[PDB]
Design a protein around this ligand. Structure first.
Ligand code: HEM
Ligand code: HEM
Ligand SMILES: CNCc1cccc(-c2cc(C)cc(N)n2)c1
Ligand SMILES: CNCc1cccc(-c2cc(C)cc(N)n2)c1
Ligand SMILES: C[C@H](O)[C@H](O)[C@H]1CNc2nc(N)[nH]c(=O)c2N1
Ligand SMILES: C[C@H](O)[C@H](O)[C@H]1CNc2nc(N)[nH]c(=O)c2N1
Ligand SMILES: [Zn+2]
Lengths: 410, 410
């Protein structure tokens, strides 16, 4: 009941007991392993105080006042407000703790060494899609910090009944538009073409280029969402050059500095925050491997390998592999020559192993998803390839949620 | 109870019901996922007929004579021999079926599209370490076929009591020697230095170079094993050159053509074959990524990147990534210019997706381990990165077993 994870590059072993505190199910049974399925699958007051009890107990058991009366009066206070209103509200300190631990428990995140250094923006007083748009601009500006990126989350009012829900309809706050062409093909980002249509549907005026920043579709208190365009001076973008190849400029590629996921749900003490955009900084491979070279994304390996003049008749020339390394040299180089925060997959996996140690020491475990932790290129020349990870679901936590245009009573 | 796996590069879905036939446990519980732990953990007659029953039932239910009397008389025959001798013996046809399906059920193997085209060598009449050495040479020679590699397995007598056990002590039939140096460092293959010591211990006369083929340590009928050196004319080796870089020859690297794992256990109908060397042909990355660039293996990225004159001050130059692609271009090129069978990680992952279709159609499922199927470089520019796989344990099956120098009553 006190399981062991081994590292095979180092022969180092650690003991996981943190998984005893786990609660939610994983998809795996004693006779089936779902570790590579992407997404496996009102809340009453009878269930809401147990979750409120569990959260608050570890929150006072973090500030070395577990079991005190300051704890007990807080437990009694939440208990009775869960009688009165049936729901409850978190303290400022309980929200900052809960948010930082949702990140800390996010087993699919390799950059979690930074989990404590997070800036929480309490937007629970927000009421309008314009108020949402204000909070979100202030997040963008702060989290960007002139390229010296800082991580942050903005927490909008929690779900109450179920109809009245704050939702950022964008998947990330900043993404490039996606238009399918009359000739069947696709301009911009193909992942967003469904979204982009809903944007033009709500009256967006598309510039119809490659790297068009989408507007925000912000839904406030269950209301029909409204389009707002982040001021372009707030959207920091990096033009992508290669430090050897001058033809690389003519590829005319760029990316935005700020990775800010907006479509997930923040669970704290049984409360559900449907709108909780959180931002850090990019690991190089997300842009240079996935965004740029996924077949159903920008799919640029074709053209990069051309300009390198590569043996493209043969699958086995590793022409694909060769153009993939140059592209991530170009992402990295470009972001750093502009002083915009980016981390390479070597230094990020190293930090994660480093983070993983401290978690097994001063916490007794680190939930971790190998399928997601291993970078999508050069897997085994990074140290996380050789690290056995235990995946389990701790709380507070970030969760996926449905897209709102497929659930909203419109 | 009829689960679904999605592919996200193609939006294609398949339905797994084959997992209903699963039997063994995985390490994962409803609340913990062990998908990245490498190895999670006499047989009586009360348990041995159920396993014999299950096997034979699907074996006649493969040749469209399920439930017939030819089946029933075979079930009665095994039943009564399990009374008489308590164990039993497989027909030739039952051994070839059982062996091909152990391969077919091997969820960690990406080359399983070939599972049916397997050559079974019945060495169950073998009695001596010299007889083992003969069968194994005939396997090497056949499976190699002048470089036109053919896949094969040699099945030595099954475990009976437990003391009398046929074991190939080598991990693979052909591996390079491993000597640690007086200066702390290591020559050859560091993975084998423990083995190499046991070989010199049993009186091996080490040439003490880099690429020294080890001898065979073959244990027959539980006896203390004996050293035999495969005739070098039978060991086909590929010198590694690059199709651009002439300095690559001076690296003086080579590899052997035949991947032949010798240390696993073949379970068929509850019978355990402790010696069952099986061989195919290499996927390029095993040599060019793992063998050559694992830190605890040949660790050549250092020197390759030197000769390329690479920015090696910075982790973020992807100098490691860059020398890794050239090395697998050199493995591939060298093996094919010599007409020795090798497959590149692109064409092998494609075939596996291709194999995966047919399994879900004419069988209803394909046990598959994503952690192992995804090649250890360029993961997401191959199609298996985007394929959800269900891992589960079907039988017949290949299993790991202890090393014999850590279990043998010597
Ligand atoms: C310090 C900078 C950060 C880095 C370098 C980083 C790194 C990464 C990477 C590479 C991924 C994989 C994304 C993908 O493959 O689609 C990821 C996912 C994730 N990150 Fe982190 N991240 C950072 C900050 C944050 C913050 C600030 C939060 C939350 C407050 C967070 C929570 C998550 C979660 C929940 C996921 C998984 C979401 C999903 O399953 O799609 N990360 N991160
Ligand atoms: C057709 C040529 C074959 C190819 C291209 C191939 C490919 C591979 C690869 C790349 C691996 C991963 C090895 C590692 O990472 O250490 C593997 C493992 C494995 N292969 Fe296949 N293989 C072939 C033939 C065979 C045969 C003939 C058998 C059995 C009769 C087999 C059964 C297995 C098993 C059981 C494993 C996993 C063993 C372990 O967990 O260490 N394969 N294969
Ligand atoms: C399924 N995609 C989720 C997703 C998509 C895109 C980016 C991220 C991300 C988020 C943060 C905070 C940091 C980072 N380096 N990347 C996450
Ligand atoms: C834990 N290592 C197992 C291992 C190590 C080395 C090679 C293989 C292998 C075996 C076969 C038959 C084909 C292939 N392409 N590779 C398997
Ligand atoms: C810790 C981790 O499970 C370990 O590195 C695994 C990961 N996947 C692998 N995949 C293959 N094909 N071969 C391996 O040796 C490994 N090693
Ligand atoms: C099918 C498979 O689970 C899917 O491709 C996963 C694999 N691992 C991943 N890992 C990361 N970091 N991001 C991803 O989108 C994925 N996709
Ligand atoms: Zn699992």
């Amino acid at each position: 009941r006190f399981l062991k994870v081994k590292n095979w590059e180092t022969d180092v072993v650690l003991t996981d007991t943190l998984h005893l505190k786990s609660t939610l199910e994983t998809g795996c049974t004693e006779h089936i392993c779902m570790g590579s399925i992407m997404l496996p699958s009102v809340a009453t007051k009878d269930q809401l105080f147990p979750l409120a009890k569990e959260f608050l107990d570890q929150y006072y058991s973090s500030i070395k006042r577990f079991g005190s009366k300051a704890h007990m009066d807080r437990l009694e206070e939440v208990n009775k407000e869960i009688e009165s209103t049936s729901t409850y509200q978190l303290k400022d300190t309980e929200l900052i703790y809960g948010a930082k631990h949702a990140w800390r428990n996010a087993s699919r995140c390799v950059g979690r060494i930074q989990w404590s250094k997070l800036q929480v923006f309490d937007a629970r007083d927000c009421t309008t899609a314009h108020g949402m748009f204000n909070y979100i601009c202030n997040h963008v500006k702060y989290a960007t910090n002139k390229g010296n990126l800082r991580s942050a989350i903005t927490i909008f009012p929690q779900r109450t009944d179920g109809k009245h829900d704050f939702r950022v309809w964008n998947s990330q706050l900043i993404r490039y538009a996606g238009y399918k062409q009359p000739d069947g093909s696709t301009l911009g980002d193909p992942a967003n073409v469904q979204f982009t249509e809903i944007c033009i549907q709500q009256g967006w005026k598309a510039p119809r280029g490659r790297f068009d920043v989408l507007p925000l579709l912000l839904q406030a208190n269950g209301n029909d969402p409204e389009l707002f365009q982040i001021p372009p001076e707030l959207v920091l973008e990096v033009p992508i050059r290669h430090p050897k190849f001058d033809w690389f400029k003519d590829l005319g590629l760029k990316w935005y500095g700020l990775p800010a996921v907006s479509n997930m749900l923040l669970e704290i003490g049984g409360l559900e925050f449907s709108a909780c955009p959180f931002s850090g900084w990019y690991m190089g491979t997300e842009i240079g491997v996935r965004d740029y070279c996924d077949n159903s994304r920008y799919n640029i390996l074709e053209e990069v390998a051309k300009k390198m003049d590569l043996d493209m008749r043969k699958t086995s020339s590793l022409w694909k592999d060769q153009a993939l390394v140059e592209i991530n040299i170009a992402v990295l180089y470009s972001f750093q020559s502009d002083k915009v925060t980016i981390v390479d997959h070597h230094s990020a996996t190293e930090s994660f192993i480093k983070h993983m140690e401290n978690e097994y020491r001063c916490r007794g475990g680190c939930p971790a998803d190998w399928v997601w932790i291993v970078p999508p290129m050069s897997g085994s020349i990074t140290p996380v390839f050789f690290q056995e990870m235990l995946n389990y679901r701790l709380t507070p936590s970030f969760e996926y949620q449905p897209d709102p245009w497929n659930t909203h009573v419109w």
